[PDB]
Amino acid sequence: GKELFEMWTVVNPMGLLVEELKKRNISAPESRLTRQSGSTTALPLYFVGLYCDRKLIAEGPGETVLVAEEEAARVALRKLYGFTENRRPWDYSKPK
C-alpha cells in the first residue's frame, strides 16, 4: 500500500523524466491542458496531459497548472518503471 515517491524523494520530477526519455531516444513531452473547471474561483481543478509525438503518455490532476503539470510527470515516471498501482501483486505463494 505504499506509493513509490513516498519511499523515494525526488525533486524536479520533470528534469528526471527528460533524461529518461532521452535514453530511449524519445522526444521531449509537450504539456497541454486536457480538462478545466472553475478557473477563476478559489477552488480550481486542472488536468494536464503530457503529449509525445501527438500521442498521450500521462495525465495528472492538480489545483494549479504548475502543480497539475508536476503531477503528470510523476504519473509518467511510475508507468515507465512499472511501479503503478494496478501492477501485478507480489508473490508469496512460492514455498521454496
Partner 1 sequence: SSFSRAPQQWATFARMWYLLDGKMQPPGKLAVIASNKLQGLNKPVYHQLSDCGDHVVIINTRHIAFSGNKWEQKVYSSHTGYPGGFRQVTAAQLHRKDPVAIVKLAIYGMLPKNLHRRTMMQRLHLFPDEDIPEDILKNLVEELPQPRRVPKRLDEYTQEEIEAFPRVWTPPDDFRM
Partner 2 sequence: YPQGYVPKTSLSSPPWQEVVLPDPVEETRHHAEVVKRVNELIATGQYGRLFAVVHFASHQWKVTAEDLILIENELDIKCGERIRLEKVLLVGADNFTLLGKPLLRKELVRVEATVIEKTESWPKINMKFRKRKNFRKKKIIVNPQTILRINTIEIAPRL
Partner 3 sequence: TYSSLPDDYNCQVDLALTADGRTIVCYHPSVDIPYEHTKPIPQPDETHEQILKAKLEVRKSKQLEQGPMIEQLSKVFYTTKHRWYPHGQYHNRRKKLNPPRDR
- Contact residues toward partner 1 (CB under 8 A) are 3, 5, 36-41, 43, 45, 60-63, 67-68, 71, 74-75, 78-79, 84-86
Q: Which does 9 bind (CB under 5 to 8 A by kind): partner 1, partner 3, partner 2, none?
A: none
Half-sphere exposure of 33 (CA within 13 A, CB side): 11
Q: Cα separations (Å) of 95 from 46, 88, 90, 91?
A: 48, 19, 14, 10
> Which residues form the interface with partner 3 (CB under 8 A)?
1, 31-34, 36, 42-43, 48-49, 51, 54-56, 59, 63-67, 69
Please report how close the Cβ of residue 94 comes to partner 3 at its closest, in angstroms: 27
- CB under 8 Å to 46, separation ≥6 — which residues? 33, 35, 36, 39, 61, 62, 63, 64, 65, 67, 68
Please report how close the Cβ of residue 70 comes to partner 1 at its closest, in angstroms: 10
